[PDB]
Amino acid sequence: KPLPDYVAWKDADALIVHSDKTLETKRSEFGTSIITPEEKLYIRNNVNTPPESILADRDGWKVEISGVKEPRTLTVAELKTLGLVTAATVLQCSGNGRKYFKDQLTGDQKMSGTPWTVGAAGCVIWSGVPLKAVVDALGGPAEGARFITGTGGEELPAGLDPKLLVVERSVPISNLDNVILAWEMNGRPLSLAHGGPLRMVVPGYSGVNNIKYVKAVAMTEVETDAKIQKTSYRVHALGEKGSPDQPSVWEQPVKSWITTPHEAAKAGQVQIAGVAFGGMNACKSVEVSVDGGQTWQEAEFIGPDLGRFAWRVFALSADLARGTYTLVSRATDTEGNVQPEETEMNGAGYGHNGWRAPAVKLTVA
Amino acid sequence: LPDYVAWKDADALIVHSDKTLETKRSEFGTSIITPEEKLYIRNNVNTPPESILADRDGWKVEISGVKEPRTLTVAELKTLGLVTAATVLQCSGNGRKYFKDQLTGDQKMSGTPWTVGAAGCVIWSGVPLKAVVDALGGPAEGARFITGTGGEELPAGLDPKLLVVERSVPISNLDNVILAWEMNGRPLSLAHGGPLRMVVPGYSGVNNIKYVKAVAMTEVETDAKIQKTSYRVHALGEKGSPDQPSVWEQPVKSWITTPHEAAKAGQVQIAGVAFGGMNACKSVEVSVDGGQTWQEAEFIGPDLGRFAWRVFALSADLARGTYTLVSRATDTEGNVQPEETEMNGAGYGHNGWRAPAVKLTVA
Ligand code: MSS
Ligand code: MSS
């Protein structure tokens, strides 16, 4: 399957093209430098990408800020005057790990959606303006405000109900201090593929909440009742419809997976590495096992600490005999949350973080 | 753009020569890490052919000056350890333009007139030299230097010492030195020293040997031209000689990176990059009036370590006019940038705060 027009610049050999809206990073392509190369970063769109014309005048891009004491519309040019913040986060789809839930289906049980393994995730550095600074410039939040609600800038088709298609998401207002209106990713102007010219980055939260080409940010008393917030991206049992009484895919859980080696290794000393994060919290420690979870050893963190929303690279130096190993990692966050062996089933297949499913088969020769 | 860097971003680079590409001041970004396609280039000799990347894991490195000396492949090196570190990769020439501006009368200085773009901050990943040396029994008794040899093919007939890119640094750097196969998450490019590079954190660019084919623990510095007489700190009109200081440790330095030319009157975000070389940057001051008044700046983004640089920013409310933006950094040991750097003949190691001032026209 060929790389779509809007991501022709990406690295075809590093990606699994599930659909034109769905590209997964290969497990062997994450690297050990923490930061995921831009041309290898995964893609997940719910609707078609806007035209490249929206990047012609980046500084002219408009964002309606409401739910504040002094509401008005500000340009990216203006936003650039109000502040500057840089932060590393784990950008991951709630769908990441869905394949593993599908593997657990018995009988006539069925689950739709992209069968992501581990490649629907990356760690990237964002740069932009803190939402707090933007809200404080406009007098602060309106009294009684409970949510940050961001609206994707895609053109909606005329005639149809906009709420059925709009990419609009709501997160609690306690995230205000963390939220970034970002125009830059990994040192470059933000690409169209990843939400340029401006993206609402919500650290620690799942991909869906990080709104590409954000054209509106509202401090609201209620969640948006858009389809994508009200019934979609909800955690429910098999056979249940989604509904707003259920937990939405917000905070990311503690998670990890092994990234290297991916298939083969020579007998003797082998460096086993991977990535680990705690979502809202930093990863405190990681254990690695070469025998599918029977025996565990403490791993070392590799590289610098990019913050509690980022991931760490970890490594275990293992001396291995000839054979077929089953490499798995189990991470713990700073609050004591640890990955389970398996994740409790849910109907849409969101938020997998089990350690057994994503095991790497290492043939040691 | 030359063949070996055709993948780079032409609009982000100033092409001085086929061996010399400078990053534009407006292209550093505020994410700390310098985009690979925008990273500067400085070669002393022609780049090897792209064929050396065909078999990366098969690339050979002669390790000597150890108890049990032998040649190891990149494949083997990958088994011995793993390390990741962010460093400031900067040419000793960076800032040479500013030294040339200080020349009076019939004084002359050769070399690329770099301003501030002969530098980047990048994440390396590879194997610690210490682990490689420990696997081979440790350093030979009496070893004083880490000497690395560039893998370029030398022309036959000519004295190899006149052209070889071979550099020596003190052995106290052993714990920091990385034999790196990866940069910013990707396999290391040919342009930046792939398939394997000797990264010496805190030291100037010249010491970070591309396509390293030999690493020796030696009792003496290599007497190669590039080490013995070149890259030495001397006065105007003096020849270089090995009694003089070599361009080793980087001094505390900074420069403003944004905005680069224009801004609207009112609130303006003034940002830049700062590092202490061997030491972390502790603090940065920014001035909008060419050094008459100073204000403390904030650090922006995460701390990538003592060898890296920090992004800093000052939020300034500015009236209409023409400002002169300058930054002055201090390291964790109290070393601070001077206004100007003492002159030296080859124009190495500029770190003054006045010369690299940005002219901001506020409308
Ligand atoms: N505007 C917008 N935004 C947005 C969207 C769309 O569609 N639109 N998607 C989501 C999702 S869903 Mo699941 O949870 S993941 C995800 C993400 C992805 O990212 P990238 O593509 O950059 O990777 O994004 C996010 N944001
Ligand atoms: N092998 C080799 N390496 C090498 C060389 C040569 O020539 N060769 N150069 C130096 C120098 S000098 Mo003055 O100090 S700066 C510098 C650097 C740069 O890097 P990039 O190009 O990658 O950026 O490199 C380094 N390394």
Numbering used by the authors:
A (entry chain A): 35 to 399
B (entry chain B): 37 to 399
What are the paper's exact sentences on this?
In most cells, the detoxification of sulfite by oxidation to sulfate (Equation 1) is catalyzed by sulfite oxidizing enzymes (SOEs). Here, we have investigated an electron transfer complex involving the periplasmic SorT sulfite dehydrogenase from the α-Proteobacterium Sinorhizobium meliloti, which represents a structurally uncharacterized type of SOE, and its electron acceptor, the c-type cytochrome SorU. In S. meliloti the SorT sulfite dehydrogenase is part of a sulfite detoxification system that is induced in response to the degradation of sulfur containing substrates such as the organosulfonate taurine. Electrons derived from sulfite oxidation are passed on to the SorU cytochrome, and likely then to cytochrome oxidase, as S. meliloti is capable of sulfite respiration.
